[PDB]
Every structure is written in C-alpha cells, then in structure tokens.
Amino acid sequence: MMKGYILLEKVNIENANAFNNIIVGIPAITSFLGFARALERKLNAKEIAIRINGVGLEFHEYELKGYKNKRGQYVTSCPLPGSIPGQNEKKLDAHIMNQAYIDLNMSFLLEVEGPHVDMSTCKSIKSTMETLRIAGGIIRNYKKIRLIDTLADIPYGYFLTLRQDNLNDAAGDDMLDKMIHALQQEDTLVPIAVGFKALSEVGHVEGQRDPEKDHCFVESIFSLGGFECSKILEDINSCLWRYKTEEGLYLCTII
Amino acid sequence: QVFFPVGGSYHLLSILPSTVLNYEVSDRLYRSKIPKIRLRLLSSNAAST
RNA sequence: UUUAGAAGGAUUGCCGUCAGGAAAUUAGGUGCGCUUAGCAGUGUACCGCCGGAGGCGG
C-alpha cells in the first residue's frame, strides 16, 4: 500500500528517565519520537523501506520508583553509584547526582507510509523491537504488533494531547504564573517537555559525539498537556505527534 | 548530547540546564497547592563544586 | 540514532502500667400485577457365537 497504521500493543518498559530539570514524571516527548526514528533507521538498513511520520502515546498503567509518605507526598529513590570517570575514580564511594526513574505500560500508534505495508512489515518490526530501548529503559515484553483500520480496534486507554490554548489564555504577567494559574483552575492537566530552543549559533566545536555534523547548544522548553480516553476521541489525527523545525526552535506538536 | 532530525539530515544538540529557572520555580511552588516533589540528593560539598 | 552511555544501601533491637458512657422518647395515613403456552435423540442398549485384541448371527 502506501499509507497505513500499525499498533504496538501493551509494551512494558522498566527504568526510564523521569527528570527534565523542573519536572519529575512522564518522560519527554522527544524520547518517544526518538524510539520511532531509531526503529525507522534500523528497518531501512535491513532494506525494508518505510517512513514513520507520526506517533500516538496511550497510557495504561504507571509506577514511580520510591514510596509515598503519610502526608501524601512522593519520595524518590536512586541506585547506588558505582565508578564514574574523572579525578576521584579510584575511590570506593562515588557521588550522588539528581535523578528519577519510572515504569510504564504503553501502546504506540505509528503512521507508516512506504511501498508495501503488510504483515511482513509487522514481522520485521517484531524482529527489531527487541534490540532497542525506550527512554533509556529496557523492554520486557509486548503483546502483539498488528495493523489497524478504524478507531474501534484501538484498545482501551488514555492518550496524551497538547493543550497550548489553556496556557496562552490565562491570567498572569509572565508564563510561569500562567502555568501555575492554569494548573490551579483545571486539575486534570500535566506539565510536559516539548523540545528545545537555541542559545548559540550553528558551528563546529571541540569534543563532539560525531565530529562531522552541525552543533548548537540548547535549552529545553515546556508546555501543558492532558488526557483523553479512546472512546471519546474524534479523529485518529488529533492524537499524533510530529516533528517541526523552525529557525532556532526544535519542536514536537500535534497539529 | 543528542541528535535531532532537521530536514533530511540531523543536527547534534548539547543541552545545558537552567539554574535561574530552577530557583524561580521552587520559590513560587512553596506557597502553592499544586502537586510537587522535593528532590533530596545533593550534599553541601557537591553543591559548592 | 531517545537529558545518550554506567551503578550491591547494609548490619542490630523489650512500648508499657491504670481506668463507670449515661439519662429521655408515638413512624404514620393510601393503593387492581396481568394477557399467553404441547418435555424427552427412539427411553434404552437384550440373549449367544467365533476365538487368541479384532469380529459376526437373532
């Protein structure tokens, strides 16, 4: 075919990152699209031409590593540090930095467009989803990889959508006051990270991961989001995240 | 350092965290009733470094 | 090609002694359940016969 939709159903991830400098919780959206782009790059070296241009994120259960106190607050845990490269590397006790970890069960909805979208493509995805990670976390098991046609085959769960209107339209002098007041009015919204902004100009520095590409120093940007059930969803395009790149801005938006 | 797709190719992005925003969020959440988590992981000698 | 890549929290323990819940009460008046109908797969699987398990007569 050409266009199509593939479901990755009930994926268990253990130990994914949950810290983005102001937020402890759901991982950033860039990692969830990075899983899809890594799946595309490994499928295109096995000579199965495909292109993923949209991801849907459905949440079925979660757990945060730690415990909940009597007062109702969350205290997080960390693994014991081992040996970290640097000056104090031959010592027996290392240092403790800032970290958080989460466990998730999720289902992914991928929009693929290639020369052939059949069940052999689903088998090729099944033989490739056992070498990748999701957000720095290992994949323990999955149920099935299948093709969907309509909005009645999608299992029960809750999707994550972008709500930027409820932020730009609230009361306050600055954006952080807008976020705090918008979270006090509606109590079903969460703050999320949605990409990066630029702090420098494109060039070549010294000390890069890949020394033959273009670099730019960046800072993360944050927004608002909320949850909507599968049975109350209108279209299958109002839950699909995509990459968008302006000049100086690296974003993920549903639009 | 991470890679980001820009138009058929990729760009390498190195992320620097914000200190001024962290101070600002922690003061404004101290007198609010929205959900919050306190992270207790750095020592005095680590913060000085 | 994912704020990428890495990680042993661990050993030990005496919560205890005492105690009066208690006095009073008005749940009450009404009420149309009601049309229709065939219980069984045959109602059981009986005498023998060859023949070292598998068969055949009435």
Next chain:
DNA sequence: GTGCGGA
C-alpha cells in the same frame, strides 16, 4: 598528597 570554600 595536601588543604579549601560555602551554603
């Protein structure tokens, strides 16, 4: 291998 500097 030493001591340092602050919250």
Next chain:
DNA sequence: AGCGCACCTAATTTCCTGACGGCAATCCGCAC
C-alpha cells in the same frame, strides 16, 4: 410491557493522660 410516592426530620453536655527517647558509617573537584 411498565412501572417502583407524595411530607418532615434526624436532641442536648462533659470530657478525650501523665514519662523517655527516636544510631553509628559513606556519598569534594581542583590548584599546587
């Protein structure tokens, strides 16, 4: 089948302990 009430109301008082104590260890890069 096709239904499954209308009205009102749910008391008052006097209190709710004195003592002691709540761990030791380890988590710092860097100039010189």
